[PDB]
Paper text:
Based on sequence analysis, we engineered a soluble construct of SMG6 TPR that spans residues 580–1166. We found that SMG6 TPR was a monomer in solution and had no propensity for self-interaction. We obtained crystals of human SMG6 TPR that diffracted to 2.1 Å resolution and used SAD to solve the structure. The model includes residues 580–1159, with the exception of disordered loops at residues 711–715, 823–878 and 955–963. The overall structure of SMG6 TPR is similar to that of SMG7 TPR and SMG5 TPR. SMG6 TPR features the typical 14–3–3 like domain (α-helices α1–α9, colored orange). It also has a C-terminal helical hairpins domain with seven α-helices (α10–α16, colored teal) that are stacked perpendicular to the 14–3–3-like domain. Additionally, the linker between the 14–3–3-like and the helical hairpins domain is longer in SMG6 than in SMG7 (68 residues in SMG6 as compared to 11 residues in SMG7). In the structure of human SMG6, an aspartic acid (Asp683) is present at the equivalent position and would be incompatible with the dimerization observed in SMG5–7 TPR. A detailed analysis indicates that the phosphoserine binding site in SMG6 is more similar to that of SMG5 than SMG7.
A well-known example is nonsense-mediated mRNA decay (NMD), which detects and degrades mRNA transcripts containing a premature termination codon (PTC) [reviewed in (3–6)]. In turn, phosphorylated UPF1 recruits SMG5, SMG6 and SMG7. These three proteins share a phosphoserine-binding domain similar to that found in 14–3–3 proteins. SMG6 is not part of the SMG5–SMG7 complex and has distinct functional modules: it contains two EJC-binding motifs or EBMs and harbors an endonuclease activity that cleaves the PTC-mRNA in proximity of the ribosome.
Residue numbers in the entry: -581 to -580, 580 to 710, 714 to 822, 879 to 954, 964 to 993, 998 to 1159
Amino acid sequence: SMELHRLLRVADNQELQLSNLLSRDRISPEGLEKMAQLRAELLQLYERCILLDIEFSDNQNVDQILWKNAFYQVIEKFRQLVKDPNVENPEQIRNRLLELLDEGSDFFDSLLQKLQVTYKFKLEDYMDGLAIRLRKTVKYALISAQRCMICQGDIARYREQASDTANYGKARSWYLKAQHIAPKNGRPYNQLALLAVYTRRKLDAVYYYMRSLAASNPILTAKESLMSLFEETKRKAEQMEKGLGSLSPSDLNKRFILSFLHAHGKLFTRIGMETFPAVAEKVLKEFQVLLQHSPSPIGSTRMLQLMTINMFAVHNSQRSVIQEQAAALGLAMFSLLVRRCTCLLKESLSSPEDQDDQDDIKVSSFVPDLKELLPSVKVWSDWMLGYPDTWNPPPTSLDLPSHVAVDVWSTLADFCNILTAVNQSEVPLYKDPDDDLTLLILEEDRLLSGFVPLLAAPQDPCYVEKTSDKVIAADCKRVTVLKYFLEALCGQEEPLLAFKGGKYVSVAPV
Protein backbone atom coordinates (compact mmCIF):
# COMPACT_ATOMS: atom_id res chain seq x y z
CA SER A 1 0.00 0.00 0.00
CA MET A 2 2.71 2.46 1.00
CA GLU A 3 4.82 1.15 -1.93
CA LEU A 4 1.99 1.94 -4.35
CA HIS A 5 1.48 5.45 -2.95
CA ARG A 6 5.28 5.84 -3.19
CA LEU A 7 5.11 4.94 -6.88
CA LEU A 8 2.35 7.46 -7.62
CA ARG A 9 4.13 10.10 -5.58
CA VAL A 10 7.13 9.75 -7.88
CA ALA A 11 4.86 9.81 -10.95
CA ASP A 12 3.10 13.09 -10.16
CA ASN A 13 6.45 14.86 -9.89
CA GLN A 14 7.59 13.24 -13.13
CA GLU A 15 4.39 14.51 -14.73
CA LEU A 16 4.94 18.07 -13.48
CA GLN A 17 8.26 18.10 -15.34
CA LEU A 18 6.65 16.65 -18.48
CA SER A 19 3.77 19.13 -18.47
CA ASN A 20 6.16 22.06 -18.18
CA LEU A 21 8.38 20.78 -20.99
CA LEU A 22 5.25 20.54 -23.16
CA SER A 23 4.10 24.08 -22.33
CA ARG A 24 6.98 25.52 -24.38
CA ASP A 25 6.18 26.82 -27.88
CA ARG A 26 9.06 24.82 -29.27
CA ILE A 27 10.97 21.75 -28.14
CA SER A 28 14.72 21.52 -28.65
CA PRO A 29 16.33 18.17 -29.57
CA GLU A 30 17.59 18.29 -25.97
CA GLY A 31 13.99 18.86 -24.90
CA LEU A 32 12.82 15.84 -26.88
CA GLU A 33 15.40 13.61 -25.17
CA LYS A 34 14.27 14.61 -21.68
CA MET A 35 10.65 14.09 -22.70
CA ALA A 36 11.43 10.52 -23.80
CA GLN A 37 13.16 9.99 -20.45
CA LEU A 38 10.16 11.32 -18.52
CA ARG A 39 7.59 9.26 -20.47
CA ALA A 40 9.54 6.02 -19.94
CA GLU A 41 9.77 6.47 -16.17
CA LEU A 42 6.08 7.34 -16.19
CA LEU A 43 5.10 4.16 -17.99
CA GLN A 44 7.25 1.92 -15.79
CA LEU A 45 5.78 3.56 -12.71
CA TYR A 46 2.12 3.32 -13.83
CA GLU A 47 2.50 -0.25 -15.13
CA ARG A 48 4.09 -1.49 -11.90
CA CYS A 49 1.11 -0.07 -10.00
CA ILE A 50 -1.33 -1.79 -12.31
CA LEU A 51 0.47 -5.13 -12.02
CA LEU A 52 0.83 -4.82 -8.23
CA ASP A 53 -2.76 -3.94 -7.31
CA ILE A 54 -5.30 -3.60 -10.14
CA GLU A 55 -8.15 -2.50 -7.87
CA PHE A 56 -6.05 0.20 -6.28
CA SER A 57 -4.95 1.26 -9.76
CA ASP A 58 -8.56 1.44 -10.94
CA ASN A 59 -9.59 3.48 -7.89
CA GLN A 60 -6.68 5.87 -8.51
CA ASN A 61 -7.56 6.04 -12.24
CA VAL A 62 -4.04 4.93 -13.21
CA ASP A 63 -5.17 3.84 -16.71
CA GLN A 64 -6.81 7.17 -17.46
CA ILE A 65 -3.80 9.03 -16.08
CA LEU A 66 -1.34 6.82 -17.97
CA TRP A 67 -3.11 7.59 -21.25
CA LYS A 68 -3.54 11.32 -20.59
CA ASN A 69 0.00 12.04 -19.40
CA ALA A 70 2.25 9.68 -21.35
CA PHE A 71 0.29 9.64 -24.62
CA TYR A 72 -2.59 12.08 -25.20
CA GLN A 73 -0.76 15.28 -24.07
CA VAL A 74 2.30 14.41 -26.13
CA ILE A 75 0.55 13.26 -29.30
CA GLU A 76 -1.54 16.45 -29.40
CA LYS A 77 1.54 18.64 -28.86
CA PHE A 78 3.24 16.87 -31.79
CA ARG A 79 0.19 17.34 -34.04
CA GLN A 80 0.32 21.06 -33.29
CA LEU A 81 4.07 21.44 -34.02
CA VAL A 82 3.73 19.74 -37.41
CA LYS A 83 1.22 22.45 -38.44
CA ASP A 84 3.08 25.40 -36.88
CA PRO A 85 4.76 27.49 -39.59
CA ASN A 86 7.30 28.41 -36.87
CA VAL A 87 8.62 24.84 -37.11
CA GLU A 88 11.53 24.40 -39.52
CA ASN A 89 11.55 20.60 -39.84
CA PRO A 90 7.88 19.54 -39.66
CA GLU A 91 8.43 16.27 -41.56
CA GLN A 92 11.00 15.30 -38.93
CA ILE A 93 8.47 15.99 -36.19
CA ARG A 94 5.88 13.88 -38.02
CA ASN A 95 8.39 11.02 -38.02
CA ARG A 96 8.88 11.25 -34.26
CA LEU A 97 5.10 11.21 -33.87
CA LEU A 98 4.84 8.04 -35.94
CA GLU A 99 7.60 6.45 -33.86
CA LEU A 100 5.89 7.36 -30.60
CA LEU A 101 2.64 5.84 -31.86
CA ASP A 102 4.37 2.58 -32.80
CA GLU A 103 6.15 2.39 -29.45
CA GLY A 104 2.73 3.18 -27.99
CA SER A 105 1.14 0.23 -29.77
CA ASP A 106 3.87 -2.07 -28.47
CA PHE A 107 3.46 -0.78 -24.93
CA PHE A 108 -0.28 -1.56 -24.84
CA ASP A 109 0.14 -4.92 -26.62
CA SER A 110 2.68 -5.78 -23.95
CA LEU A 111 0.51 -4.52 -21.09
CA LEU A 112 -2.41 -6.62 -22.33
CA GLN A 113 -0.34 -9.83 -22.14
CA LYS A 114 1.00 -8.84 -18.71
CA LEU A 115 -2.51 -8.23 -17.37
CA GLN A 116 -3.41 -11.74 -18.48
CA VAL A 117 -0.25 -13.38 -17.08
CA THR A 118 -0.25 -11.40 -13.82
CA TYR A 119 -3.98 -11.75 -13.07
CA LYS A 120 -4.41 -15.24 -14.56
CA PHE A 121 -6.93 -15.21 -17.41
CA LYS A 122 -7.30 -15.33 -21.18
CA LEU A 123 -9.25 -12.49 -22.83
CA GLU A 124 -11.07 -14.81 -25.23
CA ASP A 125 -12.84 -16.50 -22.30
CA TYR A 126 -14.68 -13.23 -21.57
CA MET A 127 -15.72 -11.85 -24.98
CA ASP A 128 -19.28 -13.10 -24.66
CA GLY A 129 -21.31 -11.17 -22.11
CA LEU A 130 -24.33 -13.33 -22.95
CA ALA A 131 -22.43 -16.34 -21.61
CA ILE A 132 -23.92 -17.39 -18.27
CA ARG A 133 -21.22 -18.38 -15.77
CA LEU A 134 -16.26 -13.06 -11.47
CA ARG A 135 -13.16 -12.82 -9.28
CA LYS A 136 -12.77 -9.23 -8.12
CA THR A 137 -9.24 -8.96 -9.60
CA VAL A 138 -10.32 -10.28 -12.99
CA LYS A 139 -13.21 -7.84 -13.06
CA TYR A 140 -10.76 -4.96 -12.68
CA ALA A 141 -8.17 -6.48 -15.06
CA LEU A 142 -10.85 -6.74 -17.77
CA ILE A 143 -11.83 -3.14 -17.18
CA SER A 144 -8.19 -2.09 -17.61
CA ALA A 145 -7.79 -4.36 -20.67
CA GLN A 146 -10.76 -2.63 -22.26
CA ARG A 147 -9.08 0.71 -21.64
CA CYS A 148 -5.93 -0.63 -23.32
CA MET A 149 -7.98 -1.56 -26.37
CA ILE A 150 -9.55 1.90 -26.58
CA CYS A 151 -5.99 3.29 -26.40
CA GLN A 152 -4.97 0.95 -29.25
CA GLY A 153 -7.86 2.26 -31.30
CA ASP A 154 -6.98 5.89 -30.63
CA ILE A 155 -3.32 5.19 -31.45
CA ALA A 156 -4.33 3.51 -34.73
CA ARG A 157 -6.56 6.45 -35.60
CA TYR A 158 -3.82 8.96 -34.76
CA ARG A 159 -1.48 7.00 -36.99
CA GLU A 160 -3.81 7.29 -40.00
CA GLN A 161 -4.12 11.05 -39.54
CA ALA A 162 -0.35 11.49 -39.07
CA SER A 163 0.13 9.68 -42.39
CA ASP A 164 -2.48 11.70 -44.29
CA THR A 165 -4.28 8.41 -44.97
CA ALA A 166 -7.60 7.07 -43.73
CA ASN A 167 -7.55 3.29 -43.47
CA TYR A 168 -9.52 3.29 -40.21
CA GLY A 169 -10.12 -0.45 -40.37
CA LYS A 170 -7.60 -1.34 -37.66
CA ALA A 171 -8.85 1.36 -35.32
CA ARG A 172 -12.43 0.12 -35.69
CA SER A 173 -11.40 -3.48 -34.93
CA TRP A 174 -9.76 -2.39 -31.70
CA TYR A 175 -12.86 -0.45 -30.60
CA LEU A 176 -15.19 -3.34 -31.48
CA LYS A 177 -13.08 -5.76 -29.41
CA ALA A 178 -13.14 -3.25 -26.55
CA GLN A 179 -16.93 -3.01 -26.73
CA HIS A 180 -17.20 -6.82 -26.53
CA ILE A 181 -15.30 -6.87 -23.23
CA ALA A 182 -17.83 -4.68 -21.48
CA PRO A 183 -20.86 -3.43 -23.52
CA LYS A 184 -21.94 -1.11 -20.64
CA ASN A 185 -18.99 1.25 -21.24
CA GLY A 186 -20.04 4.22 -23.35
CA ARG A 187 -16.50 4.96 -24.54
CA PRO A 188 -16.13 2.32 -27.29
CA TYR A 189 -19.38 3.52 -28.93
CA ASN A 190 -18.20 7.11 -28.82
CA GLN A 191 -14.92 6.28 -30.53
CA LEU A 192 -16.77 4.20 -33.12
CA ALA A 193 -19.04 7.19 -33.77
CA LEU A 194 -15.96 9.34 -34.42
CA LEU A 195 -14.80 6.86 -37.02
CA ALA A 196 -18.23 7.10 -38.63
CA VAL A 197 -18.03 10.88 -38.86
CA TYR A 198 -14.53 10.67 -40.45
CA THR A 199 -15.98 8.31 -43.02
CA ARG A 200 -19.20 10.37 -43.28
CA ARG A 201 -21.37 7.38 -42.29
CA LYS A 202 -24.04 9.69 -40.86
CA LEU A 203 -26.57 7.13 -39.61
CA ASP A 204 -23.89 4.95 -37.96
CA ALA A 205 -22.48 8.08 -36.28
CA VAL A 206 -25.88 9.02 -34.78
CA TYR A 207 -26.50 5.38 -33.78
CA TYR A 208 -23.15 5.07 -32.00
CA TYR A 209 -23.30 8.43 -30.23
CA MET A 210 -26.74 7.43 -28.93
CA ARG A 211 -25.34 4.07 -27.82
CA SER A 212 -22.73 6.09 -25.97
CA LEU A 213 -25.37 8.17 -24.16
CA ALA A 214 -27.58 5.18 -23.31
CA ALA A 215 -24.79 3.18 -21.68
CA SER A 216 -24.34 2.63 -17.94
CA ASN A 217 -21.18 4.79 -18.12
CA PRO A 218 -22.29 7.45 -20.62
CA ILE A 219 -20.04 9.83 -22.55
CA LEU A 220 -21.74 13.20 -22.00
CA THR A 221 -19.60 14.77 -24.73
CA ALA A 222 -21.67 12.72 -27.19
CA LYS A 223 -24.52 15.17 -26.56
CA GLU A 224 -22.70 18.09 -28.17
CA SER A 225 -21.44 15.78 -30.93
CA LEU A 226 -25.01 14.90 -31.84
CA MET A 227 -26.20 18.53 -31.75
CA SER A 228 -23.49 19.33 -34.29
CA LEU A 229 -24.34 16.28 -36.43
CA PHE A 230 -28.08 17.07 -36.37
CA GLU A 231 -27.41 20.72 -37.18
CA GLU A 232 -25.55 19.49 -40.24
CA THR A 233 -28.42 17.13 -41.13
CA LYS A 234 -31.00 19.92 -40.79
CA ARG A 235 -28.99 21.97 -43.28
CA LYS A 236 -28.66 19.12 -45.78
CA ALA A 237 -32.38 18.27 -45.58
CA GLU A 238 -33.34 21.91 -46.07
CA GLN A 239 -30.93 22.03 -49.01
CA MET A 240 -32.35 18.91 -50.68
CA GLU A 241 -35.77 20.58 -50.45
CA LYS A 242 -34.81 22.73 -53.47
CA GLY A 243 -43.94 8.31 -57.27
CA LEU A 244 -41.80 6.82 -54.51
CA GLY A 245 -42.39 3.42 -56.08
CA SER A 246 -40.63 4.70 -59.21
CA LEU A 247 -37.30 5.48 -57.53
CA SER A 248 -34.54 2.88 -57.32
CA PRO A 249 -33.93 1.02 -54.01
CA SER A 250 -30.69 2.97 -53.62
CA ASP A 251 -32.10 6.42 -54.27
CA LEU A 252 -35.15 5.75 -52.10
CA ASN A 253 -32.80 4.48 -49.35
CA LYS A 254 -30.59 7.57 -49.37
CA ARG A 255 -33.67 9.77 -49.28
CA PHE A 256 -35.13 7.76 -46.37
CA ILE A 257 -32.01 7.94 -44.19
CA LEU A 258 -31.96 11.72 -44.60
CA SER A 259 -35.66 12.05 -43.66
CA PHE A 260 -35.17 9.75 -40.70
CA LEU A 261 -32.18 11.68 -39.38
CA HIS A 262 -34.07 14.94 -39.98
CA ALA A 263 -37.01 13.76 -37.83
CA HIS A 264 -34.69 12.62 -35.06
CA GLY A 265 -32.74 15.86 -35.21
CA LYS A 266 -35.93 17.73 -34.39
CA LEU A 267 -36.68 15.35 -31.56
CA PHE A 268 -33.11 15.55 -30.22
CA THR A 269 -32.48 19.29 -30.57
CA ARG A 270 -36.11 20.12 -29.76
CA ILE A 271 -35.87 22.69 -32.55
CA GLY A 272 -38.21 22.91 -35.54
CA MET A 273 -40.73 20.50 -34.06
CA GLU A 274 -43.59 22.50 -35.60
CA THR A 275 -42.88 20.70 -38.89
CA PHE A 276 -42.18 17.33 -37.30
CA PRO A 277 -45.53 15.97 -38.52
CA ALA A 278 -44.57 16.57 -42.15
CA VAL A 279 -41.13 14.96 -41.84
CA ALA A 280 -42.70 12.02 -39.97
CA GLU A 281 -45.17 11.38 -42.80
CA LYS A 282 -42.25 11.53 -45.23
CA VAL A 283 -40.27 8.99 -43.14
CA LEU A 284 -43.23 6.62 -42.90
CA LYS A 285 -44.17 6.90 -46.59
CA GLU A 286 -40.64 6.15 -47.70
CA PHE A 287 -40.16 3.38 -45.08
CA GLN A 288 -43.37 1.76 -46.25
CA VAL A 289 -42.09 1.56 -49.83
CA LEU A 290 -38.60 0.34 -48.80
CA LEU A 291 -40.28 -2.54 -46.96
CA GLN A 292 -41.86 -3.77 -50.21
CA HIS A 293 -38.49 -4.05 -52.04
CA SER A 294 -36.94 -7.52 -52.22
CA PRO A 295 -34.38 -8.10 -50.85
CA SER A 296 -34.50 -5.42 -48.19
CA PRO A 297 -32.50 -2.35 -49.28
CA ILE A 298 -32.20 -1.66 -45.55
CA GLY A 299 -31.23 -5.05 -44.08
CA SER A 300 -31.57 -6.44 -40.54
CA THR A 301 -28.52 -4.74 -39.00
CA ARG A 302 -29.52 -1.26 -40.19
CA MET A 303 -33.14 -1.98 -39.26
CA LEU A 304 -31.98 -2.74 -35.68
CA GLN A 305 -30.03 0.55 -35.63
CA LEU A 306 -33.28 2.28 -36.66
CA MET A 307 -35.16 0.59 -33.79
CA THR A 308 -32.38 1.62 -31.45
CA ILE A 309 -32.53 5.27 -32.40
CA ASN A 310 -36.34 5.16 -32.06
CA MET A 311 -36.14 3.72 -28.53
CA PHE A 312 -33.53 6.33 -27.65
CA ALA A 313 -35.69 9.20 -28.80
CA VAL A 314 -38.53 8.01 -26.54
CA HIS A 315 -36.33 7.93 -23.41
CA ASN A 316 -34.38 11.10 -24.29
CA SER A 317 -37.71 12.94 -24.53
CA GLN A 318 -38.38 13.35 -20.80
CA ARG A 319 -45.88 13.05 -20.53
CA SER A 320 -44.95 15.79 -23.01
CA VAL A 321 -45.98 16.21 -26.63
CA ILE A 322 -42.43 15.49 -27.76
CA GLN A 323 -42.31 12.18 -25.89
CA GLU A 324 -45.68 11.20 -27.39
CA GLN A 325 -44.47 12.18 -30.83
CA ALA A 326 -41.27 10.12 -30.48
CA ALA A 327 -43.36 7.16 -29.34
CA ALA A 328 -45.89 7.66 -32.14
CA LEU A 329 -43.15 7.57 -34.81
CA GLY A 330 -41.59 4.44 -33.26
CA LEU A 331 -44.95 2.69 -32.97
CA ALA A 332 -45.83 3.58 -36.56
CA MET A 333 -42.53 2.23 -37.98
CA PHE A 334 -43.01 -0.88 -35.81
CA SER A 335 -46.49 -1.24 -37.26
CA LEU A 336 -45.31 -1.05 -40.87
CA LEU A 337 -42.69 -3.74 -40.11
CA VAL A 338 -45.32 -6.03 -38.61
CA ARG A 339 -47.70 -5.49 -41.53
CA ARG A 340 -44.99 -6.46 -43.97
CA CYS A 341 -44.21 -9.52 -41.84
CA THR A 342 -47.88 -10.45 -41.95
CA CYS A 343 -48.01 -10.21 -45.78
CA LEU A 344 -44.94 -12.36 -45.94
CA LEU A 345 -46.37 -15.01 -43.62
CA LYS A 346 -49.60 -15.34 -45.58
CA GLU A 347 -47.76 -15.40 -48.87
CA SER A 348 -46.82 -18.74 -47.33
CA LEU A 349 -54.59 -20.52 -44.77
CA SER A 350 -57.98 -21.10 -43.14
CA SER A 351 -59.68 -19.17 -40.31
CA PRO A 352 -58.25 -19.30 -36.73
CA GLU A 353 -60.66 -21.79 -35.09
CA ASP A 354 -60.61 -23.81 -38.32
CA GLN A 355 -56.81 -24.12 -38.55
CA ASP A 356 -55.74 -27.76 -39.03
CA ASP A 357 -52.36 -28.72 -37.53
CA GLN A 358 -51.25 -30.38 -40.76
CA ASP A 359 -51.52 -26.95 -42.41
CA ASP A 360 -49.54 -24.88 -39.89
CA ILE A 361 -46.82 -22.61 -41.27
CA LYS A 362 -43.51 -24.21 -40.35
CA VAL A 363 -40.81 -21.87 -39.10
CA SER A 364 -38.27 -23.66 -41.31
CA SER A 365 -40.35 -22.49 -44.28
CA PHE A 366 -39.93 -18.76 -43.44
CA VAL A 367 -38.82 -16.85 -46.57
CA PRO A 368 -35.62 -14.81 -46.35
CA ASP A 369 -37.42 -11.47 -46.60
CA LEU A 370 -39.35 -12.42 -43.42
CA LYS A 371 -36.29 -13.54 -41.53
CA GLU A 372 -34.60 -10.17 -42.21
CA LEU A 373 -37.36 -8.28 -40.36
CA LEU A 374 -38.17 -10.50 -37.39
CA PRO A 375 -35.19 -9.52 -35.19
CA SER A 376 -36.25 -5.86 -35.32
CA VAL A 377 -39.93 -6.72 -34.64
CA LYS A 378 -38.82 -8.80 -31.64
CA VAL A 379 -36.50 -6.14 -30.16
CA TRP A 380 -39.14 -3.37 -30.44
CA SER A 381 -41.70 -5.72 -28.78
CA ASP A 382 -39.23 -6.36 -25.90
CA TRP A 383 -38.94 -2.60 -25.51
CA MET A 384 -42.74 -2.18 -25.41
CA LEU A 385 -43.15 -4.73 -22.58
CA GLY A 386 -40.43 -2.77 -20.81
CA TYR A 387 -42.31 0.56 -20.99
CA PRO A 388 -46.04 -0.22 -21.19
CA ASP A 389 -47.14 3.27 -20.10
CA THR A 390 -45.57 4.93 -23.19
CA TRP A 391 -48.04 3.26 -25.55
CA ASN A 392 -50.99 2.30 -23.35
CA PRO A 393 -53.12 4.31 -23.70
CA PRO A 394 -51.85 5.06 -27.22
CA PRO A 395 -50.12 8.40 -27.86
CA THR A 396 -52.47 10.89 -29.52
CA SER A 397 -50.15 13.82 -30.29
CA LEU A 398 -49.00 12.95 -33.83
CA ASP A 399 -51.33 13.98 -36.65
CA LEU A 400 -49.87 13.57 -40.13
CA PRO A 401 -50.69 16.42 -42.57
CA SER A 402 -52.65 13.97 -44.76
CA HIS A 403 -54.63 12.85 -41.70
CA VAL A 404 -54.12 9.25 -42.82
CA ALA A 405 -53.21 7.25 -39.71
CA VAL A 406 -51.22 4.06 -39.10
CA ASP A 407 -53.37 1.61 -37.13
CA VAL A 408 -50.89 -0.14 -34.84
CA TRP A 409 -53.38 -2.21 -32.88
CA SER A 410 -55.33 -3.57 -35.83
CA THR A 411 -52.05 -4.40 -37.52
CA LEU A 412 -51.01 -6.27 -34.36
CA ALA A 413 -54.36 -8.13 -34.23
CA ASP A 414 -53.91 -9.29 -37.84
CA PHE A 415 -50.37 -10.47 -36.95
CA CYS A 416 -51.76 -12.37 -33.98
CA ASN A 417 -54.26 -14.05 -36.26
CA ILE A 418 -51.70 -15.24 -38.85
CA LEU A 419 -49.33 -16.27 -36.05
CA THR A 420 -51.85 -18.76 -34.64
CA ALA A 421 -51.21 -20.75 -37.81
CA VAL A 422 -47.45 -20.75 -37.23
CA ASN A 423 -45.89 -23.80 -35.63
CA GLN A 424 -42.66 -23.06 -33.82
CA SER A 425 -42.25 -26.54 -32.35
CA GLU A 426 -39.73 -27.86 -34.90
CA VAL A 427 -37.09 -26.96 -32.34
CA PRO A 428 -38.28 -27.42 -28.75
CA LEU A 429 -37.03 -24.75 -26.35
CA TYR A 430 -36.19 -25.42 -22.71
CA LYS A 431 -36.06 -23.29 -19.55
CA ASP A 432 -33.37 -25.36 -17.81
CA PRO A 433 -29.87 -26.47 -18.91
CA ASP A 434 -28.87 -30.07 -19.56
CA ASP A 435 -25.93 -32.05 -20.91
CA ASP A 436 -27.56 -32.47 -24.32
CA LEU A 437 -28.64 -28.83 -24.49
CA THR A 438 -26.89 -25.52 -25.13
CA LEU A 439 -27.64 -21.82 -24.64
CA LEU A 440 -29.55 -20.07 -27.45
CA ILE A 441 -28.55 -16.42 -27.81
CA LEU A 442 -30.10 -14.27 -30.55
CA GLU A 443 -27.77 -12.11 -32.66
CA GLU A 444 -30.01 -9.03 -32.07
CA ASP A 445 -29.83 -9.38 -28.27
CA ARG A 446 -26.03 -9.56 -28.55
CA LEU A 447 -25.94 -6.41 -30.69
CA LEU A 448 -28.10 -4.40 -28.29
CA SER A 449 -26.42 -5.68 -25.14
CA GLY A 450 -25.47 -2.61 -23.10
CA PHE A 451 -28.39 -0.47 -24.25
CA VAL A 452 -29.85 0.70 -20.93
CA PRO A 453 -33.53 1.04 -22.04
CA LEU A 454 -33.58 -2.67 -22.94
CA LEU A 455 -32.39 -3.73 -19.48
CA ALA A 456 -36.09 -3.75 -18.48
CA ALA A 457 -37.26 -6.59 -20.76
CA PRO A 458 -37.06 -10.27 -19.74
CA GLN A 459 -33.70 -12.01 -20.04
CA ASP A 460 -34.88 -15.59 -19.28
CA PRO A 461 -32.27 -18.07 -20.57
CA CYS A 462 -33.23 -20.43 -23.38
CA TYR A 463 -31.76 -23.83 -24.20
CA VAL A 464 -31.91 -26.05 -27.28
CA GLU A 465 -30.50 -29.45 -28.17
CA LYS A 466 -26.93 -29.39 -29.50
CA THR A 467 -28.18 -31.31 -32.53
CA SER A 468 -30.84 -28.82 -33.61
CA ASP A 469 -30.58 -26.49 -36.60
CA LYS A 470 -29.53 -23.24 -34.89
CA VAL A 471 -30.98 -20.88 -37.54
CA ILE A 472 -34.44 -22.50 -37.20
CA ALA A 473 -33.98 -22.62 -33.40
CA ALA A 474 -33.40 -18.86 -33.33
CA ASP A 475 -36.52 -18.15 -35.38
CA CYS A 476 -38.56 -20.54 -33.20
CA LYS A 477 -37.44 -18.50 -30.20
CA ARG A 478 -38.42 -15.22 -31.97
CA VAL A 479 -41.88 -16.57 -32.82
CA THR A 480 -42.34 -17.78 -29.21
CA VAL A 481 -41.32 -14.34 -27.85
CA LEU A 482 -43.74 -12.51 -30.18
CA LYS A 483 -46.58 -14.92 -29.32
CA TYR A 484 -45.91 -14.25 -25.61
CA PHE A 485 -45.81 -10.52 -26.41
CA LEU A 486 -49.20 -10.60 -28.08
CA GLU A 487 -50.58 -12.66 -25.14
CA ALA A 488 -49.13 -10.10 -22.72
CA LEU A 489 -51.02 -7.34 -24.60
CA CYS A 490 -54.24 -9.39 -24.42
CA GLY A 491 -53.75 -9.95 -20.68
CA GLN A 492 -53.04 -6.28 -19.91
CA GLU A 493 -55.29 -4.44 -17.42
CA GLU A 494 -56.93 -2.16 -19.99
CA PRO A 495 -55.95 -4.19 -23.08
CA LEU A 496 -55.60 -2.82 -26.64
CA LEU A 497 -56.10 -6.23 -28.18
CA ALA A 498 -58.70 -8.94 -27.43
CA PHE A 499 -59.84 -12.23 -28.82
CA LYS A 500 -63.39 -11.27 -29.76
CA GLY A 501 -65.97 -13.08 -31.85
CA GLY A 502 -63.67 -15.77 -33.21
CA LYS A 503 -60.48 -13.79 -33.92
CA TYR A 504 -58.01 -11.34 -32.40
CA VAL A 505 -59.07 -7.74 -33.01
CA SER A 506 -58.22 -4.23 -31.87
CA VAL A 507 -60.24 -2.96 -28.90
CA ALA A 508 -58.14 0.24 -28.82
CA PRO A 509 -59.88 3.67 -28.85
CA VAL A 510 -61.10 5.41 -32.01
